[PDB]
Scaffold this active site. Structure first.
Site, PDB file in Angstrom:
ATOM      1  CB  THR E   1      -0.935   0.030   1.214  1.00 57.28           C
ATOM      2  OG1 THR E   1      -1.802  -1.109   1.174  1.00 57.28           O
ATOM      3  CG2 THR E   1      -1.772   1.291   1.205  1.00 57.28           C
TER       4      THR E   1
HETATM    5  B1  LIG Z   1      -2.153  -2.406   1.888  1.00 55.35           B
HETATM    6  O1  LIG Z   1      -1.443  -3.437   1.360  1.00 55.35           O
HETATM    7  O2  LIG Z   1      -1.752  -2.354   3.181  1.00 55.35           O
HETATM    8  C1  LIG Z   1      -3.730  -2.631   1.738  1.00 55.35           C
HETATM    9  C2  LIG Z   1      -4.505  -1.288   1.450  1.00 55.35           C
HETATM   10  C3  LIG Z   1      -5.891  -1.346   0.731  1.00 55.35           C
HETATM   11  C4  LIG Z   1      -6.170  -2.093  -0.436  1.00 55.35           C
HETATM   12  C5  LIG Z   1      -7.427  -2.149  -1.100  1.00 55.35           C
HETATM   13  C6  LIG Z   1      -8.620  -1.472  -0.718  1.00 55.35           C
HETATM   14  C7  LIG Z   1     -10.041  -1.543  -1.498  1.00 55.35           C
HETATM   15  C8  LIG Z   1     -11.045  -2.513  -1.204  1.00 55.35           C
HETATM   16  C9  LIG Z   1     -12.300  -2.631  -1.844  1.00 55.35           C
HETATM   17  C10 LIG Z   1     -12.678  -1.772  -2.868  1.00 55.35           C
HETATM   18  C11 LIG Z   1     -11.746  -0.800  -3.213  1.00 55.35           C
HETATM   19  C12 LIG Z   1     -10.501  -0.706  -2.556  1.00 55.35           C
HETATM   20  C13 LIG Z   1      -8.314  -0.722   0.460  1.00 55.35           C
HETATM   21  C14 LIG Z   1      -7.058  -0.662   1.127  1.00 55.35           C
HETATM   22  N1  LIG Z   1      -4.239  -3.447   2.852  1.00 55.35           N
HETATM   23  C15 LIG Z   1      -3.745  -4.667   3.187  1.00 55.35           C
HETATM   24  O3  LIG Z   1      -2.778  -5.134   2.500  1.00 55.35           O
HETATM   25  C16 LIG Z   1      -4.268  -5.548   4.354  1.00 55.35           C
HETATM   26  C17 LIG Z   1      -3.467  -6.862   4.556  1.00 55.35           C
HETATM   27  C18 LIG Z   1      -4.464  -8.004   4.795  1.00 55.35           C
HETATM   28  C19 LIG Z   1      -5.824  -7.333   4.903  1.00 55.35           C
HETATM   29  N2  LIG Z   1      -5.693  -6.032   4.160  1.00 55.35           N
HETATM   30  C20 LIG Z   1      -5.971  -6.230   2.710  1.00 55.35           C
END
Ligand SMILES: *[B]([O])([O])[C]([C]C1=[C][C]=C(C2=[C][C]=[C][C]=[C]2)[C]=[C]1)[N]C(=O)[C]1[C][C][C]N1[C]
Lengths: 235, 242, 229, 215, 209, 195, 233, 213, 236
Positions: E1
């Site tokens: 992210t």
């Molecule tokens: B990052 O890698 O930390 C991640 C951030 C993130 C990704 C996608 C979305 C999204 C969801 C649905 C519709 C549109 C956009 C939001 C935020 N988050 C993570 O990796 C963590 C690790 C495990 C659980 N999360 C995904």
């Protein structure tokens, strides 16, 4: 009279609850609605009300579940509370279990909703009477009065000129064997026309009509379909 | 349904007033009189003891001038019964302010608290108002000696001298005509006797009667109250000069 | 909508419902309290009843605590609910502070309860007047609580029927330095003269404080010796 | 009771006077001082002195409640509040937080105020010492002589036992309680950044701040 | 992210990756992290996925009502203050989200980093995410505030690449927006196979490092 | 983690704090942080600890104090302000952490210039010199050796300079940027120092 | 009672308990606010018995926030409780938005809470009519008249209270668009005691600017009063 | 001793959308840790005429989550008199799923349907109120295996993007290819699978038989 | 109310409070709405009590949402709470369900609050009359909510003091098929016949919700001028 009227608690010296007798005649001002029970179909028709020739006709027929529909006659706001209660009741039963709500048990569940608004003095009796027409495993028609009461009928009428429409139904015993919905829908439409005032608006494509039966879920009668039915009524 | 049995104590009148407060003001216009006076030395409160009997203890008590806090005190005029409800309430308020902010409550802030509760009953609740109104004199380091006059309606007002109770007009007239802005404590005490004597149209007080108290902050808020003995000298002094 | 005050200010500025409660207090059996140099006397006359009743089963002079007695003049039903609620305060106080509650704070607490029914909604004012007497570290006390809720400090008082001349009789026969034995003598006499058809035996009641002894109720054996004069 | 905010409170009884003493430290952590004015001795009343020892948050928070209720009692009374009535109140106040305790170990010191005639022409009488000591859940460990609490409760018990004599006047009592405190604080490394001995008599109140070792 | 923002000479350049991975597996690689909070204000997801997608779109609900009852556009300072408070009510409930609210209001161009613990902060060059440290590292050595639009988006794309390069959990398509004085536009809804573009231009070897 | 220093004289009170934002512990986030919460009634409230809890607590104190001064035309006393802050900090202590360290300061007509020191556990007590955070272990000694009675404002800032170049030289994270809040002569003067 | 509708529709359609609340405002003190380019002046009527009743009552001209006026007119009993709710609201808004509440938002809340008390059960309608002067989100002065019925509207120069009809019809004919700092004082003074006695003690006037609401002292108040009696001769 | 309330019943749900359709396929095996409860437990429940949902988490939560969602949808139809779009349903499922964020459903859901003339569309969730439109998504035990396969054929790392056109018939065969690969490579994948094809006119429930091991 | 409560049936079957509130909606300024197959047009009288008023803060045609606008009649202060309530409910719907609310559905939640006093929380019936309109789907819609709670969809309704006259004019001059501009000139002509002497900019606040853009639009002083100049009925 003057003293035995103010609240829904005082009994008249003849044991009559005036404040639920008065709300029981609010249904007598709504437009007529007729339900006819066949051997395996139920036909519900009601006269929509137009307050002006610019306004759209008011909705009379409401759908509750796949095979349950009603036709209120009274205060529209009070009915809208009951339809939401009934809809939220058939859906919850179809959610908690996987069955269809027992129509006999559903009517009791809404017939005592009338009741709880009668014991207390901070509440008022519902000013609306319902026409719970449904096909659970056999066709059946119900009616709930503003006082907690319900009955299973073979034909109904509501309020406006119901006595005129009842005379047509009271003298017609064919409705039991009246298969061939065409032959049955005409019977109901003729009944609704009977209550309808002469030298006034005739039954037009702005009068509600719906059916429910064996393999016939609660469906409206479309105006293109409905239009020819009105033609045979003129005969 | 007790709708027929209700009195609607919180309902406006056709002329925009409240009858319950209208009558409560009438109730406190027939009660014993209470006098407030601000001097340079301190604030004077003196009320008239309504006679009941000679068998009253009249030694270690009197039911007009109570203590609300070490630096605030009140002189009640009205229904004595429900005054103790507000006195206990205001005692709680003045002690909870000290609980929160670790300092004594300014007088002007206690009054608005005790007037909000007095007003709340005539705003909502369907209950009768507090048929009680009392001067609340006190000393605060911010704005010095103060004197506030409350009301069953809940609206208060700061004053320099007020004479609520029965025959208040004859006691406000003498106060207005003789309240010099700068007065000594003993001078104010004599004025309190003069307005108390004239309000109840007696030439001289009796000391089985009107009682007096004050603050006269001496950097420690002495807050003294008179037993009957000290008032003969006040009565003697009034006689000599009047 | 069911909690609205039934006690409302009359146009002439009087809580007329309280004036009615005081009417009934002024028609009950006269209770009487007298305090002396070394004790307090509360006395009430319990009209000569039928022999069917058990006189000890009803006592208008009940006891609040070790040194705090009580007597009423009004509706017997309200005394019990008030007496029972008064004992809770005397126990609740002692559950915080070690010492037994003292009369001044007990009277103020009770008077706040009598005032509540005067103001709160849907209830009637208490139809009785109390005489709470006790012995404290601040000497002896004798208070009276009106149906209105306001309380008075007394040296001698009456609350029952015809208490106008009853209290006037005490004024000319009471002094601050009255002996407790003489106080009972005067307490009997004032009840005796007010009681029409004087048969003041089996129909009287006395409660004494006795100079910091525990509050005691004189049984009738200890009363007949006080009826000689 | 915590090593955090280490502080001790001591009280002692003389012939006709009582002395209450404390240390003035306010230690943020165990071994870190931030203030030496934190007097733990409060004046509840003219002859009712309370000494709160323990966590300073609960020392102050309890003191607000005690001061809020003593004033409420006295004002509603028009009478000076006495120790044994106040002492039992402090016992119940602590217990009301039985499961969320006020981490303090209070000391209550002050005269008892008997009220017999004292003469044919007198009203009130001599006074009684009335020492008492509690813990966090309010156990009234009443004692006729010295009472201690704090982190040096065990250090103070030993010295007081070996130095306290039965009855002493104001001058004699002050010296013993000062020695019983200075030489007991010098054996604690989390308390004793300056003492404050407060010996009081029926007539006067003496406040002294000793030249304690600050280490 | 990864997440960026500039408050550069004539706007704000917000840039994010498009990778959503659970544990060590890449669940999706075409997620949209920029959210149309308002016509002028737009937020960003980071940390937990739903804990910010739900609340930012819940925050958009609050703004829409406020912008309609008062019929004045809300400010970024007020929008951020609203968000930080509601995220503070869930301290111990395990929420995890780092939001960078950037937008244009009456008081100029504003940015506010908002974190799951009510961490509101005003700044010029915020960045959040697992790869934020590398993204910060590039920007601090190239940020000018005098950059024009053409090379501001290039810097943002350059930073997102290098963050996704060093970070395991950052990658996928690169989104770079621009916030006007009236609204915003989507400058880059782009790609990420351009490792062989910035450095190691010619595919000839393995790019030793 | 963040350093708060306060010094009280007979005619001044000077509050010092680093302008750092430790958030995202692997790094700094802002180089000019806002921890001071100036109150209208010539008062200030300096908070340390977690940045999330500083906004929730400090802003809440500021509204309540301002509301008090608007309901009541007075200006809330520093002693009231200090002990009301401790009450709320202790009130939430057994329900929500609020790991925030306070340094209450202000000027009062009756009590003069006062400084109050508060731990995350509500351990309020008036002091002549305060120090919060991990930097307290390194700035408290200067605040003792070089501080004497009735200092003037200029000398106090010279003392604060002596503390700052100590955290740079010896403290683990060498904080370089500090913000002061000098209260004297009915003024609230703000100046930023570096190194 | 407790939870009963005391304000109900009269057979003609009116709300009698609101109509009576309006008549409670008329038995009050007149208040006048005047708008200008970037400041607003508020002048009100005060009644004090001579030599007694020190003017610490300060009924009208209530500070709400750093920049928010309020000059009510009606039952002083309901004035404090209504005002204190707004002051509670003003800080809560400044806590949930981190920006001071605009004048329009406060007026909308006062109109909301006043209308709430004429719709709930067992609550008496506020017998108070207020007017608020302040600055919107953009720095732009505004005055918001309010009525006990809950109706509110922004006004350039409005008078409320006892016999406000006479003041309003006078204020409508000689209001300039952007008057001076000393003109707004004069217009407010000339209008406020067209119905009040000409004495300078009866009127209390204060002027609101971008910062630090200023109360006009008795020096010029007496000065302008002597400029008005000669105007009446 | 602690009663952990979460178990995984296995099974995989495969979603794949085309230009004017969408293919949702799932197995039917319901199993405990290593034994097998039943060999036919459908994981796909239709919602409207043109929107179906498939879930591959814990079967107790799946039955009530689908039942809750159809209850909401039918309630929506009665109050608003028109069948909700898939976007409406997808958003609503996000609220319902997030409504229990602090005790989440142990179910991963894929929502498929058509909104435009056709515009075959598909959403995927992760147990908590989050959804992104995807061209292809699969959840469950085979999620780790199938997702790489779907990527290689739908998107491309391939040098030349062959098979640019994708007719409906071949995509069905591709999913049968995929769902069979997961079956022989995953422990929990089923033995009989249901393949749905939400085309312009409706949905087909053509069934395919898989290995029984 | 002399010996009756809010929930009391008259001996004729009607409630007392709601039939009393019906007389409270015949006092507001006249508002005229017209629904054609291209978008709803809402017109409203502007009754400026005095020239001192700003004419801007006081408004008659608010917007319930991005695609809904309403008129008012009766107690103006009592109508703001409905519109404010409807705004939250309309926005709340847009959050739970991603789409925009049906005007028919928006009216129902307003209608059911209009009798929240009945107790199957308010305490007296609302005394207003709304004229909601919008373009959700199935073309534009125009509804009309009464204090009694009954709501009937209209093609061209009218509310306010002179609504009886306005509906008389609309009931003759309205045709099912009109262009957008024919509706705009029709609404002004109806108001012109019932409004006061001057048909100026400061007298009406017409707003439109076009089907195409699907967004309400409050006509400014310029867009409102080009409609008055039409004068399709120059009859005096
Ligand atoms: B990052 O890698 O930390 C991640 C951030 C993130 C990704 C996608 C979305 C999204 C969801 C649905 C519709 C549109 C956009 C939001 C935020 N988050 C993570 O990796 C963590 C690790 C495990 C659980 N999360 C995904």
């Amino acid at each position: 009279r003057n003293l035995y009227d103010t609240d829904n608690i005082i009994y008249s010296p003849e044991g009559r609850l005036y404040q639920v007798e008065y709300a029981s005649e609010a249904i007598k001002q709504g437009t007529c609605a007729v339900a006819i029970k066949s051997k395996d179909y139920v036909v519900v028709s009601g006269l929509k009300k137009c307050i002006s020739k610019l306004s759209f006709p008011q909705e009379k027929i409401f759908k509750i579940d796949d095979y349950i529909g009603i036709s209120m006659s009274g205060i529209t706001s009070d009915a809208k509370v009951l339809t939401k209660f009934m809809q939220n009741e058939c859906l919850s039963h179809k959610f908690l279990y996987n069955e269809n709500i027992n129509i006999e048990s559903l009517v009791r569940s809404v017939a005592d909703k009338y009741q709880k608004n009668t014991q207390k003095s901070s509440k008022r009796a519902f000013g609306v009477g319902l026409m719970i027409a449904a096909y659970h495993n056999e066709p059946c028609i119900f009616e709930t009065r503003p006082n907690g009461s319900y009955f299973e009928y073979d034909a109904l009428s509501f309020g406006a000129r119901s006595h005129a429409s009842k005379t047509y139904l009271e003298k017609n015993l064919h409705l039991f064997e009246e298969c061939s919905l065409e032959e049955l829908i005409l019977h109901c439409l003729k009944a609704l026309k009977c209550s309808l005032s002469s030298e006034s608006e005739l039954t037009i494509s702005n009068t509600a009509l719906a059916v429910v039966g064996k393999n016939h879920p609660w469906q409206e009668i479309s105006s293109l379909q409905l239009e020819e039915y009105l033609s045979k009524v003129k005969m | 349904m007790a709708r027929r049995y209700d009195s609607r104590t919180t309902t406006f009148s056709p002329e925009g007033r409240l009858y319950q407060v209208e009558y409560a003001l009438e109730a406190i216009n027939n009660a014993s009189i209470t006098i407030g006076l601000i001097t340079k030395d301190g604030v004077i409160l003196g009320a008239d003891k309504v006679f009941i009997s000679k068998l009253i203890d009249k030694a270690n008590n009197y039911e007009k001038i109570y203590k609300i806090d070490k630096h605030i005190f009140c002189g009640v005029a009205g229904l004595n019964a429900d005054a103790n409800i507000l006195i206990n309430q205001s005692r709680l308020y003045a002690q909870r302010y000290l609980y929160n902010y670790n300092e004594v409550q300014p007088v002007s802030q206690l009054v608005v608290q005790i007037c909000d509760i007095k007003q709340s009953y005539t705003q909502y609740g369907g209950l009768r108002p507090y048929g009680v109104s009392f001067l609340i004199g006190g000393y605060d380091t911010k704005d010095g000696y103060q004197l506030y006059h409350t009301d069953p309606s809940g609206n208060y007002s700061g004053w320099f001298a007020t004479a609520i109770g029965t025959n208040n007009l004859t006691a406000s007239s003498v106060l207005k005509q003789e309240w010099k802005n700068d007065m000594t404590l003993e001078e104010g005490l004599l004025l309190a006797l003069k307005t108390l004597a004239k309000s109840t149209d007696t030439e001289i007080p009796k000391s089985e009667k009107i009682e007096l108290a004050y603050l006269t902050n001496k950097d420690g808020e002495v807050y003294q109250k008179y037993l009957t003995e000290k008032e003969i000298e006040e009565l003697i002094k009034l006689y000599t000069q009047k | 909508e069911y909690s609205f005050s039934l006690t409302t200010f009359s146009p002439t500025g009087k809580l007329v419902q309280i004036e009615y409660a005081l009417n009934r207090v002024s028609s009950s059996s006269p209770a009487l309290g007298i305090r002396a140099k070394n004790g307090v006397i509360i006395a009430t006359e319990k009209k000569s009843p039928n022999e069917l009743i058990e006189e000890n089963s009803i006592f208008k002079i009940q006891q609040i605590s070790e040194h705090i007695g009580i007597v009423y003049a009004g509706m017997p039903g309200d005394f019990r609910v008030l007496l029972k609620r008064a004992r809770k305060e005397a126990i609740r106080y002692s559950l915080q502070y070690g010492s037994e509650i003292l009369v001044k704070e007990l009277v103020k607490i009770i008077a706040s309860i009598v005032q509540e029914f005067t103001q709160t909604g849907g209830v009637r004012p208490f139809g009785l007047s109390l005489l709470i007497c006790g012995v404290d570290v601040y000497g002896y006390h004798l208070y009276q609580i009106d149906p209105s809720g306001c309380y008075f400090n007394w040296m001698a008082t009456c609350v029952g029927k015809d208490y106008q001349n009853n209290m006037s009789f005490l004024e000319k026969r009471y002094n601050k330095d009255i002996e407790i034995e003489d106080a009972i003598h005067t307490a009997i006499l004032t009840l005796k003269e007010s009681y029409e058809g004087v048969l003041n035996e089996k129909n009287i009641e006395i409660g004494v404080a006795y100079d910091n002894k525990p509050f005691k109720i004189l049984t009738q054996n200890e009363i007949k010796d006080y009826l000689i004069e | 009771i915590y090593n955090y905010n280490g502080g001790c409170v001591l009280g002692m009884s003389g012939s006709n006077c009582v002395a209450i003493a404390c240390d003035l430290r306010l230690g943020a952590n165990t071994f870190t001082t931030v203030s030496t004015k934190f007097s733990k001795i409060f004046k509840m009343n003219n002859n009712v002195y309370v000494g709160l020892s323990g966590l300073a948050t609960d020392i102050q928070t309890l003191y607000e409640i005690l001061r809020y209720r003593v004033n409420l009692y006295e004002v509603r009374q028009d009478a000076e509040m006495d120790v044994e009535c106040f002492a039992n109140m402090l016992s119940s106040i602590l217990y009301s937080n039985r499961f969320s305790p006020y981490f303090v170990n209070p000391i209550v010191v002050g005269f008892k105020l008997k009220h017999y005639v004292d003469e044919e022409g007198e009203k009130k009488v001599n006074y009684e010492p009335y020492l008492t000591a509690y813990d966090l859940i309010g156990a009234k460990c009443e004692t006729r002589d010295f009472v201690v609490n704090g982190v040096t409760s065990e250090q103070l018990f030993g010295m007081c036992e070996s130095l306290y004599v039965k009855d002493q006047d104001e001058n004699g009592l002050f010296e013993t309680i000062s020695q019983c405190l200075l030489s007991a604080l010098d054996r604690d490394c989390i308390s004793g950044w300056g003492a404050e001995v407060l010996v009081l008599t029926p007539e006067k109140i003496i406040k002294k701040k000793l030249k304690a070792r600050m280490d | 992210t990864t997440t960026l923002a500039f408050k550069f000479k004539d706007g704000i350049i917000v840039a994010v990756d498009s990778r959503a991975s659970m544990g060590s597996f890449i669940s999706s690689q075409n997620v949209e992290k920029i959210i149309e909070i308002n016509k002028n204000i737009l937020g960003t997801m980071a940390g937990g996925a739903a804990d910010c997608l739900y609340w930012e779109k819940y925050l958009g609900k609050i703004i829409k009502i406020y912008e309609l009852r008062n019929n004045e556009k809300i400010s970024v300072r007020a929008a951020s203050t609203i968000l930080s408070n509601i995220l503070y009510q869930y301290k111990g409930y395990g929420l995890c989200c780092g939001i960078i609210l950037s937008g244009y209001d009456h008081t100029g161009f504003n940015m506010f980093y908002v974190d799951d613990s009510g961490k509101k902060v005003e700044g010029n060059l915020f960045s959040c995410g697992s790869g934020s440290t590398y993204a910060y590292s590039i920007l601090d050595s190239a940020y000018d505030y005098n950059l024009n639009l053409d090379q501001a988006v290039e810097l943002a794309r350059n930073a997102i690449y290098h963050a996704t390069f060093r970070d395991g959990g950052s990658g996928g398509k690169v989104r770079v927006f621009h916030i006007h004085k009236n609204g915003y536009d989507k400058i880059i809804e782009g790609e990420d196979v351009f490792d062989l573009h910035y450095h190691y231009t010619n595919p000839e070897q393995k790019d030793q490092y | 983690m963040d350093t708060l220093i306060g010094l009280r004289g007979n005619n001044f009170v000077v509050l010092a704090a680093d302008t750092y934002s430790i958030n995202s512990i692997i790094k700094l986030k802002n180089d000019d942080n806002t921890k001071f919460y100036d109150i209208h009634g010539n008062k200030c409230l300096l908070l340390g600890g977690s940045i999330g809890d500083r906004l929730q607590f400090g802003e809440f104190i500021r509204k309540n104090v301002h509301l008090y001064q608007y309901q009541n035309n007075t200006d809330m006393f520093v002693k009231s302000f200090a002990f009301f802050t401790r009450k709320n900090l202790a009130y939430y202590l057994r329900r929500n952490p609020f790991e925030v360290n306070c340094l209450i300061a202000g000027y009062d007509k009756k009590d003069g210039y006062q400084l109050y020191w508060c731990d995350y556990l509500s351990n309020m007590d008036s002091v002549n010199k305060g120090a919060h955070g991990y930097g307290a272990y390194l700035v408290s000694a200067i605040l003792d050796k070089y501080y004497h009675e009735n200092l003037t404002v200029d000398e106090a800032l010279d003392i604060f300079k002596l503390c700052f170049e100590e955290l740079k030289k010896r403290f683990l994270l060498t904080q370089i940027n500090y913000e002061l809040r000098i209260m004297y002569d009915n003024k609230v003067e703000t100046q930023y120092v570096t190194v | 009672s407790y939870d009963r509708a005391i304000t109900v529709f009269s057979p003609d359609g009116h709300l009698l308990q609101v109509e009576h609340a309006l008549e409670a405002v008329k038995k009050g003190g007149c208040a006048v606010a005047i708008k200008s380019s970037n400041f607003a002046v508020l002048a009100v009527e005060k009644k004090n018995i001579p030599k007694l009743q020190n003017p610490k009552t300060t009924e009208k001209l209530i500070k709400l926030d750093e920049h928010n006026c309020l000059a009510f007119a009606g039952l002083n009993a309901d004035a404090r409780v209504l005002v204190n709710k707004t002051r509670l609201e003003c800080q809560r808004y400044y806590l949930n938005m981190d920006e001071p509440a605009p004048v329009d938002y406060i007026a909308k809340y006062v109109a909301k809470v006043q209308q709430k008390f004429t719709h709930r059960g067992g609550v008496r309608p506020f017998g108070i009519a207020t007017l608020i002067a302040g600055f919107k989100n953009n720095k732009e002065i505004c005055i918001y008249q309010t009525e006990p019925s809950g109706i509110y509207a922004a006004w350039k120069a409005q008078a409320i209270g006892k016999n406000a009809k006479i003041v309003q019809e006078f204020l409508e004919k000689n209001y300039q668009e952007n008057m001076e700092q000393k003109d707004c004082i004069f217009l407010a003074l000339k209008a406020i005691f067209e119905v009040v006695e000409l004495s300078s003690k009866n009127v209390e006037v204060a002027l609101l600017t971008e910062k630090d609401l200023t109360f006009i002292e008795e020096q010029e108040i007496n000065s302008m009063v002597e400029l008005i009696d000669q105007e009446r001769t | 001793k602690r009663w952990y309330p979460y178990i995984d019943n296995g099974g995989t749900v495969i979603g794949l959308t085309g230009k004017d359709y969408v293919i949702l396929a799932a197995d039917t095996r319901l199993s405990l840790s290593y034994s097998i409860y039943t060999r036919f437990c459908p994981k796909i429940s239709k919602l409207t005429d043109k929107c179906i949902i498939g879930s591959s988490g814990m079967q107790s939560d799946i039955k009530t989550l689908h039942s809750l969602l159809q209850k909401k949808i039918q309630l929506f139809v009665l109050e608003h008199s028109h069948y909700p779009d898939i976007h409406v349903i997808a958003r609503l499922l996000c609220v319902i799923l997030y409504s229990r964020r602090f005790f989440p459903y142990y179910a991963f859901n894929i929502l498929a349907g058509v909104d435009e003339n056709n515009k075959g569309v598909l959403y995927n969730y992760d147990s908590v109120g989050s959804y992104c439109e995807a061209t292809h998504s699969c959840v469950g035990s085979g999620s780790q295996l199938i997702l790489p396969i779907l990527d290689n054929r739908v998107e491309q790392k391939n040098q030349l993007i062959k098979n640019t056109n994708f007719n409906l018939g071949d995509d069905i065969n591709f999913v049968k290819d995929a769902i069979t690969s997961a079956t022989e490579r995953d422990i929990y994948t089923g033995d009989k699978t249901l393949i749905y094809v939400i085309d312009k006119m409706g949905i087909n429930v053509n069934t395919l038989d898989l290995k029984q091991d | 109310e002399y010996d009756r409560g809010v929930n009391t049936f008259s001996p004729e079957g009607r409630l007392f409070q709601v039939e009393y509130a019906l007389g409270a909606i015949k006092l507001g300024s006249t508002a005229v709405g017209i629904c054609v197959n291209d978008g709803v047009i809402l017109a409203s009288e502007r009754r400026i009590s005095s020239t001192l008023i700003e004419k801007d803060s006081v408004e008659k045609l608010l917007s319930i949402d991005d695609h809904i606008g309403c008129a008012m009649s009766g107690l103006m202060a009592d109508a703001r709470t409905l519109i404010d309530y409807a705004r939250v409910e309309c926005n709340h719907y847009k959050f739970i369900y991603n789409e925009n609310i049906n005007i028919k559905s928006c009216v129902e939640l307003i209608s059911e609050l209009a009798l929240d006093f009945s107790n199957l929380i308010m305490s007296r019936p609302f005394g207003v009359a709304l004229l909601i309109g919008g373009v959700d789907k199935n073309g534009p819609c125009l509804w009309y909510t009464e204090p009694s709670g009954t709501n009937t969809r209209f093609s061209a309704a009218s509310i306010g003091s002179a609504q009886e006259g306005a509906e008389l004019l609309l009931q003759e001059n309205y045709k099912k098929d009109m262009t957008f501009e024919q509706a705009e000139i029709l609404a002004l002509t109806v108001l012109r016949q019932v409004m006061e002497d001057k048909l100026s900019t400061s007298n009406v606040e017409i707003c439109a919700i076009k089907k195409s853009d699907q967004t309400f639009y409050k006509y400014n002083t310029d867009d409102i001028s080009r409609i008055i100049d039409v004068l399709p009925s120059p009859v005096y």
